[PDB]
Design a binder for this molecule. Structure first.
Ligand SMILES: [Cu+2]
Ligand SMILES: [Cu+2]
Lengths: 321, 321
């Protein structure tokens, strides 16, 4: 152990993530290790490990040098299996090993995501401070311009820092939304208290519900404030039966993936194949809005669970998010 | 009572259905029979009959030589009383009699529908085969042109058969829906397990409900295949909030009644007077959909009947059709 060790290892793992590791130790590990030959390092007698492997083997896991969204029900599951290994390691010998072994044949997004969540929640990651996403995978936090300016630097082997950019809109209250600090927090908040947490993982995040209610209420408040300061008017509430008034162009790019799709202004909400129907929301919204109005949330049995009490708002945040 | 017999009386009955019977027996039965004096032929002591009669007498039954759709709540009820008589005869003397007695004063659709149903479920119709509707009442299964060609062969008495008809649509998968066999089947399937069946009539049809779910799912299935074969793409699902994209003109005619109305394309669903509001669907659709989602259907007392079991899909079909 140590930390200036654990730490070191981490830094190495997340170094030039888009390419096979250059740190020799990480690679003989990456090669010689077998997550299945001492089912003892694992507190599960390695059921986790044996499940990743099985996938890695039938090679039914997402490819490397490809994008990844945490909203993709499969990409998530895969990402989250790495979490589950890293998670039941008794000591560092087992983490390093895996987050090396996998690091090299699992996709980067799943991987970056997996490592962070794992470091954050696993028993074994106390000493560590995680590098800032913004510098680990800069395509998600940097402009598309600066990105290309950086690819040029590199082509020519000439160094230096480029100035990023952001009178026509409400990309006047932009400084708020595009800040690398908020973006960090926004992701961290949901890494700290993930929507996918099962108390099987080890403990129980306390009031994730009210936490959820509140955190957004404040982005939402903080946001409303800035627009105040900009002669702008408080934000419109979004409806599924209306047009999406204010659309934008992000001018942002994926590393592997392409450029973030843009949305024109005054658009009509389309039924999106694979996710869900527009109407599917409308009804959800109704079911929600009826719990609130009745006084109770009704479970699967037709058991009405009361929410006209203090535990109220979290039970509500459990069903809303 | 052979069946040869049984059978013969039945082809007699349904011969030249649009004009007074020409078979002399059926006639003088038609005239001298009294469905209510010897109410010992009825296993109901002629409750059945004494109701038809009453109607027949206050003259509030639907006229002859007029159309009839099985969807008309009255038209449906009258048709269905005939059913109730034929149904409580102890032997052929009683059917012959009524389907003769009634044949001659009761509307022809009521009458053709009443005799088949009766023939199909009454305990007294075993040996018979019913003639193919397509040849009993051919306006329903034949073109409007063919029909017309046929009125001319008859005005001039020179005989002859006509070829029916069916590059501009999806009346390219026509050969499927316009087939006299399908068509047969699709009506028979609903005569075998009728939507109006009360188990007071006699026995209980067994899984009408999954039977219902399943038969349509195979029309639909079968339907979807043919389109495949025609470079056409799978069928849109219909919504009450969008346009009826594809209308058609059936170029079909009724014998008494006129030409079947046509639907222009890209139409908007109108609230239709006497049947129900568009919205009315809209909420029934919701009501249904929530039963699917809750885990339970809820009766009129407010008792939730669970459908997350094998009797499941049938309970559902009983509230769906
Ligand atoms: Cu969030
Ligand atoms: Cu049908």
């Amino acid at each position: 152990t140590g930390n200036a060790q654990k730490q070191q290892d981490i830094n190495h793992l997340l170094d030039k993530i888009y390419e096979p590791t250059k740190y020799p130790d990480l690679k003989d590990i990456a090669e010689n290790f077998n997550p299945l030959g001492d089912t003892s390092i694992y507190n599960d007698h390695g059921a986790a490990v044996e499940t990743l492997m099985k996938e890695l083997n039938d090679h039914r896991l997402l490819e490397q040098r490809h994008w990844y969204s945490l909203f993709n029900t499969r990409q998530r599951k895969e990402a989250l299996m790495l979490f589950a290994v890293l998670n039941q390691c008794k000591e560092w010998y087992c983490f390093r090993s895996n987050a090396a072994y996998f690091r090299e044949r699992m996709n980067e997004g799943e991987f970056v995501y997996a490592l962070y969540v794992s470091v954050i929640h696993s028993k074994l990651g106390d000493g560590i401070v995680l590098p800032p996403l913004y510098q680990i995978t800069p395509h998600m936090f940097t402009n598309s311009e600066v990105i290309d300016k950086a690819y040029s630097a590199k082509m020519t082997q000439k160094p230096g820092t480029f100035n990023v950019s952001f009178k026509n809109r409400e990309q006047r209250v932009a400084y708020f939304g595009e800040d690398i600090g908020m973006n960090i927090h926004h992701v961290t908040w949901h890494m700290d208290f993930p929507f996918w947490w099962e108390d099987s993982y080890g403990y129980h995040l306390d009031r994730k519900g009210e936490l959820f209610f509140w955190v957004h209420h404040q982005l939402t408040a903080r946001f409303d404030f800035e627009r105040l300061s900009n002669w702008l008017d408080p934000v419109d509430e979004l409806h599924w039966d209306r047009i999406i008034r204010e659309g934008f162009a992000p001018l942002t790019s994926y590393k592997y993936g392409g450029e973030f799709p843009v949305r024109p202004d005054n658009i009509h909400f389309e039924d999106v194949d694979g996710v869900a129907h527009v109407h599917d929301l409308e009804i959800t919204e109704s079911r929600i809005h009826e719990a609130i109005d009745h006084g109770y949330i009704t479970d699967s049995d037709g058991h009405t669970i009361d929410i006209r009490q203090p535990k109220g708002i979290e039970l509500l945040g459990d069903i809303i998010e």
